[PDB]
Amino acid sequence: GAMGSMERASLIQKAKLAEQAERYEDMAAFMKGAVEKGEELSVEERNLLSVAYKNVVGGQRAAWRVLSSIEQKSNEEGSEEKGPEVREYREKVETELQGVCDTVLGLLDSHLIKEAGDAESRVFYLKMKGDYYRYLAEVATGDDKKRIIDSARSAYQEAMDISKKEMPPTHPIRLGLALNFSVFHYEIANSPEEAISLAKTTFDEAMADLHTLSEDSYKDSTLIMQLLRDNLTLWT
């Protein structure tokens, strides 16, 4: 693509630089370029990929929620008619967001997922697939909302099934996947109970496996366990 002429290692090197420079769009473009080299991603590389896009889409999502909240406010009784602009700009942001999601989903589908045979890669990618469908779900309001949601669900579930089978309960990816899946339950699938049960169970099973971990791995897991806890605290 755009990055077809750059060396894979250069793209990775530049993804790391863009990250240091907080240039996440660049980062994501370099990583997409790297993915498009056709070689599987190492752990660090998938991490770069995830981070790049998570940041990109995280900015679009945040912007989308700003605009969406503005838009809903302009749809309140007594709100002055402001014209199409808010909806238009929300749509513009939303379209670009969806385009990022589609891009990521497209990378996962061509061909990260099919080539991801280790649980750590496969679960990582499915988690990401769940995430990006969830971000699509966040803005989805049409007749595909259900399908988008269940694509998120299905990718999360497959990732949960493998991670449960193949990863220790404390695995950061397992924990992160559960955290997100639980958030999906909570705010996408309108299943706060499942969200809470998932976050609780995940947290508790991680707790019980902390003992097997070195100090470095301990610190990785508890970091995500804390996010589970933050959500449990928020939600209960």
């Binding site: 992160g176 955290l179 997100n180 996010l227 959500n231 939600w235």
Partner: peptide, 6 residues
């Protein structure tokens, strides 16, 4: 106060 995801 925003739920966490990772």
């Amino acid at each position: 106060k925003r739920r966490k995801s990772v």
